[PDB]
Design an enzyme around this catalytic site. Structure first.
Site, PDB file in Angstrom:
ATOM      1  N   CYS A 122       0.637 -12.743  -9.551  1.00 41.44           N
ATOM      2  CA  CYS A 122       1.274 -11.450 -10.234  1.00 41.44           C
ATOM      3  C   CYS A 122       1.715 -10.752  -9.001  1.00 41.44           C
ATOM      4  O   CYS A 122       2.624 -10.821  -8.368  1.00 41.44           O
ATOM      5  CB  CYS A 122       0.507 -10.658 -11.265  1.00 41.44           C
ATOM      6  SG  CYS A 122       1.131  -9.284 -12.021  1.00 41.44           S
TER       7      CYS A 122
ATOM      8  N   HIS B  75       5.185 -11.788  -9.926  1.00 40.95           N
ATOM      9  CA  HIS B  75       5.639 -11.150 -11.215  1.00 40.95           C
ATOM     10  C   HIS B  75       7.224 -10.717 -10.977  1.00 40.95           C
ATOM     11  O   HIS B  75       7.395 -10.307  -9.709  1.00 40.95           O
ATOM     12  CB  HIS B  75       4.754 -10.037 -11.779  1.00 40.95           C
ATOM     13  CG  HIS B  75       5.210  -9.706 -13.226  1.00 40.95           C
ATOM     14  ND1 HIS B  75       6.199  -9.017 -13.220  1.00 40.95           N
ATOM     15  CD2 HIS B  75       4.653  -9.855 -14.338  1.00 40.95           C
ATOM     16  CE1 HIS B  75       6.483  -8.729 -14.588  1.00 40.95           C
ATOM     17  NE2 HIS B  75       5.379  -9.522 -15.256  1.00 40.95           N
TER      18      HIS B  75
END
Ligand SMILES: [Cu+2]
Ligand SMILES: [Cu+2]
Ligand SMILES: [Cu+2]
Lengths: 187, 187
Positions: free
Chosen positions: A105, A125
Site C-alpha cells: 500500500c 496503492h
C-alpha cells in the site's frame, strides 16, 4: 528450522494490511513477531483498531535476523516508518544480507525514504504512486503483487491476501502456500 | 444519524474476520463498537493477534440498540459466543426488533446455539457446515455471502471483504458500498 518474520507496526498502520499478513504467515508456520515501532504499548491503527504488539521494535531488532521484514501500509503508518532511524537500519541490514523485504500500500514509500532497492519494479496503492515515484528511482507496476528479487510489493487492503501468500510462497514454497490458501475460501 | 454496529469479540475469534468488517464499516461512516465478550481486557485471537476492545460487552449492551450485530468466526471464538448468555440475549433482542444480524465463518453456529433465525438460508465455513446443520434448522448455501432477510452470513477470511461490503450496502446503501469499495483495490 522455521522461518521468521518481523512485522513493523506504527500508529496509523492500516490494520487489515497488518493482520492479514500476520495471520496468514502464522497459518504457514512462520514465526511472526509483531513489533511496535514506538515501544510495547498498544498501537492505534488507521481505522482505530487497537493492536497490542508482541514486542517493541527496540527489543525485536535484537532478535534478528529475520527471513522477511514486512511493512504494512496506511498513509500515516508509512510516514512513521519513513521517518524512523531504527527502520532505516533494519531495512539496510536486511537488504545487505539479501533478505526479503515486503511492503504493501503506502508501505513501499518507506523503501524510498530509506533508499532501499532502487531500480526495483514496484507497486503501491494508486494514491501513493506519485510519492513512490518522486525522483524516478523505481519502475512502476500496476500488478496486484509485484516481486523483483528480494523486494516484494502490493497495492492495498484488497490485495493483502495475495501479498501474504506471496510472502509464504517465497519463504516456505508453493505447496505450503497452496495448503494455507485453501481453507481461507478465497476467490 | 449514523448507523451503529456492535462487533462481539471473544478469545479465539478469527482476527481477519474481526478487523476487516470493523475497518470497512468505519470507512463507510458506521459507528462501530468492538465489544469484548469477557470484559474490556485485550483479546487473544485465533492466530495470536491481540486486539484491545473499545468496551466490554456488558457496557456496550447498555448503549444499544445497534443497526447490526456482527459475529466474527474462528472455531473457538464462535464456541465462546455460542456459550454466552449475554450473546443469547443480544441476538434475541436484535431478532425481535427486526435488526440485522451478520455472522461469518464459524460465527453462524452461534445463531444455532441461541435459536436465532431458524428457517433461514445460511452459509458458513465449509468445516462448520455439519455443526450448523445439526437438526436441519437452516437451509445451506455455498454462496460466498448469503442474505436471507435480516440474517446475513458468509464463509471465511477470504470472503470477509464481501461480507463487510454486504453489511455496508444493507445499512448505508449501494452507492456508499461502491464508494468504500474502490480504494480497497479488490478483485
Ligand atoms: Cu492501504
Ligand atoms: Cu491491546
Ligand atoms: Cu474463519
Amino acid at each position: 528450522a522455521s522461518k521468521r518474520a518481523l512485522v513493523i507496526l506504527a500508529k496509523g498502520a492500516e490494520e487489515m494490511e497488518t493482520v492479514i499478513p500476520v495471520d496468514v504467515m502464522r497459518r504457514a508456520g512462520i514465526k511472526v513477531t509483531v513489533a511496535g515501532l514506538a515501544g510495547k504499548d498498544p498501537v492505534q491503527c488507521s481505522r482505530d483498531v487497537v493492536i497490542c504488539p508482541d514486542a517493541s521494535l527496540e527489543d525485536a531488532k535484537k532478535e534478528g535476523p529475520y527471513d522477511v521484514v514486512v511493512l504494512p501500509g496506511g498513509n500515516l503508518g508509512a510516514q512513521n516508518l519513513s521517518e524512523s532511524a531504527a527502520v532505516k537500519e533494519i531495512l539496510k541490514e536486511q537488504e545487505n544480507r539479501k533478505g526479503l523485504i515486503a511492503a504493501i500500500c503506502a508501505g513501499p514509500t518507506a523503501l524510498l525514504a530509506h533508499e532501499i532497492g532502487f531500480g526495483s519494479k514496484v507497486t503501491t496503492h494508486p494514491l501513493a504512486k506519485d510519492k513512490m515515484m518522486n525522483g524516478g528511482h523505481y519502475t512502476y507496476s500496476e500488478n496486484r503483487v509485484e516481486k523483483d528479487g528480494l523486494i516484494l510489493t502490493s497495492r492495498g487492503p484488497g490485495t493483502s491476501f495475495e501479498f501474504a501468500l506471496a510472502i509464504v510462497e517465497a519463504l516456505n514454497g508453493k505447496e505450503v502456500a497452496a495448503q494455507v490458501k485453501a481453507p481461507l475460501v478465497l476467490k
